[PDB]
Design a protein around this ligand. Structure first.
Ligand SMILES: *[C@@H]1O[C@H](CO)[C@@H](O[C@@H]2O[C@H](CO)[C@@H](O[C@@H]3O[C@H](CO[C@H]4O[C@H](CO)[C@@H](O)[C@H](O)[C@@H]4O)[C@@H](O)[C@H](O[C@H]4O[C@H](CO)[C@@H](O)[C@H](O[C@H]5O[C@H](CO)[C@@H](O)[C@H](O)[C@@H]5O)[C@@H]4O)[C@@H]3O)[C@H](O)[C@H]2NC(C)=O)[C@H](O)[C@H]1NC(C)=O
Ligand SMILES: CCCCCC/C=C/CCCCCCCC(=O)O[C@H](COC(=O)CCCCCCC/C=C\CCCCCCCC)COP(=O)(O)OC[C@H](O)CO
Ligand SMILES: CCCCCC/C=C\CCCCCCCC(=O)O[C@H](COC(=O)CCCCCCC/C=C/CCCCCCCC)COP(=O)(O)OC[C@H](O)CO
Ligand SMILES: CCCCCC/C=C\CCCCCCCC(=O)O[C@H](COC(=O)CCCCCCC/C=C\CCCCCCCC)COP(=O)(O)OC[C@H](O)CO
Ligand SMILES: CC(C)CCC[C@@H](C)[C@H]1CC[C@H]2[C@@H]3CC=C4C[C@@H](OC(=O)CCC(=O)O)CC[C@]4(C)[C@H]3CC[C@]12C
Ligand SMILES: *[C@@H]1O[C@H](CO)[C@@H](O[C@@H]2O[C@H](CO)[C@@H](O)[C@H](O)[C@H]2NC(C)=O)[C@H](O)[C@H]1NC(C)=O
Ligand SMILES: *C(=O)CCCCCCCCCCCCCCC
Lengths: 493, 278
């Protein structure tokens, strides 16, 4: 193959070119693209429904020309005699005179309830909040709204009060966990109206003992619209390079007398998966609204992760210089065992979590008593599979190192024809293993750095966004990894 | 000083619809300052807000440092809620490319320009107020709570979005009261600098328990407190009277509750041990 024939100078040159490309991949994210996500906090406007529901929606608007009759703060409903079901928390998702665009491509909403601590009125042991949520969309101002979804959204209140329960600390807010609210897969329309209602009933326990809610907040998360454009440019630049190199790789393979060996087919499949990821399908989300885009982009990268693990284990297995011939995938209980089962479990998990969110944007698998059990069982099985795969990989690495050590005591006593074959096999295995370890170390190190850091540095006169720099650099690093795999391990002249 | 008329005449241009909210937020800080000092010899009286401008040498006390910080903090808090509630058109903004400043830099800047313009001079007292106002704004940023959400691969933590959320105003009042307990007296000019997050005063407080009409002191006479604890030492030391009234007080009692609202209650009679110091 090409990796065998090339001298040290050509290998160093191609490594340097890849290094330059990876530096560019870091720099594009660091110095061009803004932060990956934008979290904007909203305060719900407590409108007053001073009528009886006549089967016609009102779409209480918080601010603007037709703004709802609102109470600025609770305890204003006591002088005005306002019931519990007559308060409609309304949030206009585009903060005044702004507008959402299809360059955000996802819309995460989560609720942050403000509950005051009162000695008489406290949160029950198992408090569930039931919300009569109605969501609407609108492209042009001075136009009607249209209902996207309207269903009851039940959430469990996991609130705690660290402060002592003495009357000296009454009126303090509960320290409560954030409730997952909604995630729609595409920013279809410019404006969104969200009305949240909290009906109460004493005969059947709905919104009973949920505490003393003062305000409910809401955080809107989207992909910043500028990180999206840079990501799209990167994907558009990466798809033709990978596609051409894969076509060239398979064209060279289907030019020799021998049929392809297992390792070359696995490399071809890994290139296929990388190509599948970097096809810029999401450009079509700018003109068309498809809520299934997150599912597609999740399945693509899950497939690539599974194929990468399979490639690692098969590369380790094939490079042992044993008496057995280890082509013919049938016999790899090490690959299809944990990897396939874990991938299937994660696929079921994402179909039951992000797949159901398509029809019901407010669905969360964690709210159901048995749904969370089934989900956590799926992640438990996936984690067990991942641990088993890591154990098998470590065992295979130890075995291949032991085999290399055993052979290397008898390389000099060979016919200097197959001896060069074994020396080259050992060198190629060590070289790719060190590259894989270095790539994984960089991935983990920069991931930890991004997770622990705020996101942007100021070493110079310009902010350096390391959060998006991570994503661009990892994308480029693994694309270049697949590129080097398909270029080094290709048939040569 | 912190009045709507003063914020209008002595206020920045190009931000004219905010002056009603700026003065309103300054009042929110004052009523918090009154709460934090309800059991002390100085109950954050509203007199030391407009009469505390002149006579800067005798008004550069530890208490006026808390006045400026809590008022500047209140303006930042009230404007941030206004922007989050949509009460102002553009708060922070590109929107398409990179988003905005999380509607708290706008609240900080609106607070900064409106309250820093009040101090016309640049003398020793003026430097103090600019320092104390900045310390109050920093206390708002320091008290902020950080919460994060994992929305990665299949809802994993491959990508995490983290945002800052304002704490309730009571938390910052406690934070600034703590900074008031540890305050630095400066020597003749605000020689060496001082920490950005620390309150600074210039002249020591007077004997507040003794009544002085000229110095705007109402004395520690005819005031409620608690014995169970802070008073007594603030009443027996200065003031030869305790005079436990033991007068009945009517309050809410045996109520049925919902998450909010006007509710069904009754009247409940019980005597209490209220005190009037001195
Ligand atoms: C930013 O966010 C801030 C809070 O987060 C907002 O602050 C709120 O601003 C409003 C607007 O002024 C204030 O709330 C009321 O303000 C009234 C102002 O007086 C006005 O009165 C008439 C209009 O109603 C009119 O003549 C004028 O326009 C005049 O300016 C106050 O009168 C009102 O007083 C309240 O308290 C009184 C004493 O407890 C009580 O008697 C009053 O009762 C009246 O109202 C109730 C309810 O409508 C009736 O049932 C009664 O019969 C009676 O008519 C009243 O309850 C109140 O202070 C206030 O400054 C502030 N509110 C809060 C809760 O903090 C900012 O406005 C926001 N910024 C922007 C730009 O929007
Ligand atoms: C920011 C960094 C991103 C990650 C960096 C990845 C780089 C990792 C470096 C790993 C070094 C692996 C070499 C291990 C030592 C080794 O294998 O033997 C050494 C080989 O020494 C070398 O010249 C190896 C040169 C390797 C150059 C870097 C490799 C880059 C190639 C592909 C990278 C894959 C994508 C990774 C991300 C791309 C951007 C960096 C000695 O061999 P030998 O003389 O005994 O035998 C000669 C042989 O027959 C030649 O024909
Ligand atoms: C505390 C321990 C930390 C654990 C670290 C976990 C590892 C990685 C965490 C982050 C995963 C990857 C970051 C996500 C980037 C990514 O997926 O990009 C994907 C591309 O997918 C990739 O190529 C990422 C490949 C990551 C490979 C990780 C492998 C790390 C290996 C770890 C184990 C090491 C075993 C070593 C074996 C050695 C054998 C010789 C494209 O995104 P998209 O276009 O679909 O849109 C989504 C985008 O985010 C916005 O829309
Ligand atoms: C080395 C393996 C480590 C694990 C050891 C295995 C032992 C036990 C496993 C159980 C521990 C797992 C903890 C997960 C808990 C969990 O469910 O977290 C959930 C969300 O976590 C998840 O959804 C994890 C899903 C899987 C994470 C990795 C994403 C998919 C990875 C690769 C894509 C497919 C590759 C397939 C490879 C197959 C190899 C076998 C939320 O809990 P929360 O409500 O408390 O927090 C809210 C949060 O803000 C929501 O974002
Ligand atoms: C990106 C996701 C949606 C899947 C995309 C599938 C293609 C990227 C793959 C699947 C079928 C592949 C092809 C299968 C057939 C071959 C023929 C091969 O050309 C030859 O065999 C020449 C024979 C000779 O030596 O004379 C070159 C690669 C190619 C086009 C493959 C290229 C890439 C292809 C199109
Ligand atoms: C109120 O405060 C003023 C000034 O702090 C007091 O006036 C001083 O009183 C002392 C009494 O020992 C004199 O030595 C000073 O000369 C006075 N200074 C001035 C400028 O008059 C005053 O006594 C206090 N009490 C009252 C009731 O005014
Ligand atoms: C969160 O749920 C991540 C997405 C789940 C991954 C999707 C499943 C894809 C299946 C992988 C197929 C390739 C397996 C290769 C082994 C032979």
């Amino acid at each position: 193959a090409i990796i065998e024939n090339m001298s040290t100078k050509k290998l160093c040159i191609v490594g340097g070119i890849l290094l330059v490309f990876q530096i560019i991949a870091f720099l594009v994210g660091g110095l061009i693209a803004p932060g990956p996500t934008t979290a904007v906090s909203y305060m719900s406007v407590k409108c007053v429904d001073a009528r009886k529901n006549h089967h016609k929606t009102k779409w209480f608007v918080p601010w603007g020309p037709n703004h709802c009759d609102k109470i600025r703060d609770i305890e204003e409903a006591i002088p005005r005699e306002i019931e519990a079901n007559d308060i409609v928390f309304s949030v206009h998702i585009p903060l005044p005179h702004m507008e959402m665009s299809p360059w955000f491509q996802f819309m995460l909403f989560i609720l942050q309830l403000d509950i005051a601590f009162k000695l008489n009125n406290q949160i029950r042991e198992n408090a569930e909040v039931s919300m009569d949520v109605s969501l609407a969309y609108r492209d042009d101002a001075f136009a009607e709204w249209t209902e996207m979804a309207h269903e009851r959204v039940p959430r469990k209140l996991k609130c705690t009060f660290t402060s002592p329960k003495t009357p000296e600390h009454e009126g303090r807010y509960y320290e409560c966990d954030v409730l997952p609210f909604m995630e729609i897969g595409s920013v279809a329309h410019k404006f969104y109206l969200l009305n949240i209602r909290l009906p109460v009933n004493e005969k059947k326990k709905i919104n009973v003992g949920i505490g003393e809610i003062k305000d409910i907040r809401l955080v809107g998360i989207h992909q910043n619209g500028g990180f999206t454009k840079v990501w799209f440019a990167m994907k558009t630049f990466l798809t033709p390079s990978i596609f051409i190199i894969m076509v060239w790789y398979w064209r060279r393979i289907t030019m020799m007398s021998r049929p392809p060996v297992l390792l070359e087919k696995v490399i071809f499949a890994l290139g296929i998966s990388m190509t599948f990821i970097n096809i810029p399908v999401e450009w079509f989300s700018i003109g068309f609204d498809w809520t299934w885009m997150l599912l597609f982009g999740d399945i693509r990268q899950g497939i690539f992760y599974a194929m990468l693990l399979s490639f690692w284990i098969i590369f380790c297995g094939e490079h042992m210089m044993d008496q057995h011939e280890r082509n013919h995938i049938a016999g790899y209980w090490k690959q299809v065992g944990p990897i396939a089962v874990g991938s299937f479990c994660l696929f079921i998990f994402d179909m039951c979590e992000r797949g159901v969110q398509l029809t019901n944007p407010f669905y969360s698998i964690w709210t159901t008593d048995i749904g969370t059990e089934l989900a956590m069982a799926f992640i438990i099985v996936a984690g067990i599979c991942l641990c088993l795969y890591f154990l098998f990989l470590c065992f295979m690495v130890f075995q291949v190192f032991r085999n290399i050590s055993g052979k290397q005591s008898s390389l000099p006593a060979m016919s200097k024809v197959r001896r060069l074959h074994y020396e080259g096999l050992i060198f190629r295995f060590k070289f790719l293993m060190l590259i894989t370890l270095a790539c994984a170390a960089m991935t983990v190190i920069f991931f930890i750095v991004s997770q622990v850091t705020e996101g942007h540095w100021k070493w110079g006169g310009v902010t350096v966004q390391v959060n998006s720099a991570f994503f661009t650099g990892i994308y480029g690093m693994w694309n270049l990894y697949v590129f080097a795999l398909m270029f080094l391990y290709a048939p040569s002249h | 000083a912190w009045s709507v008329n003063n914020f209008l005449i002595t206020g920045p241009k190009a931000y004219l619809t905010y002056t009603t909210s700026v003065a309103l937020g300054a009042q929110s800080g004052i009523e918090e300052c009154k709460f934090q000092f309800a059991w002390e010899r100085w109950n954050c009286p509203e007199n030391a807000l407009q009469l505390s401008t002149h006579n800067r040498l005798r008004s550069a006390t530890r208490e006026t440092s808390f006045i400026h910080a809590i008022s500047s903090a209140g303006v930042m808090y009230i404007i941030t809620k206004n922007c989050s509630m949509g009460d102002f058109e553009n708060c922070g903004c590109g929107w398409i490319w990179g988003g905005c400043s999380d509607n708290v830099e706008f609240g900080e800047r609106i607070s900064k320009l409106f309250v820093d313009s009040l101090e016309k001079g640049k003398d020793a007292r003026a430097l103090m107020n600019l320092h104390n106002n900045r310390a109050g704004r920093l206390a708002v940023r320091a008290t902020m709570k950080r919460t994060c959400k994992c929305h990665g691969i299949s809802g994993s933590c491959s990508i995490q979005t983290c945002w800052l959320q304002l704490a309730e105003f009571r938390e910052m009042g406690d934070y600034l009261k703590a900074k008031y307990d540890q305050a630095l007296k400066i020597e003749m000019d605000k020689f060496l600098p001082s920490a950005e997050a620390e309150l600074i005063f210039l002249e020591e407080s007077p004997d507040y328990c003794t009544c002085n009409s000229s110095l705007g002191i109402y004395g520690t006479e005819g005031r409620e407190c608690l014995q169970n604890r802070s008073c007594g030492r603030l009443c027996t030391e200065c003031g030869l009277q305790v005079e436990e009234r033991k007068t009945e007080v009517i309050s809410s009692c045996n109520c049925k509750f919902q998450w909010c609202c006007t509710v069904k209650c009754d009247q409940c009679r019980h005597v209490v041990s209220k005190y009037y110091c001195a």
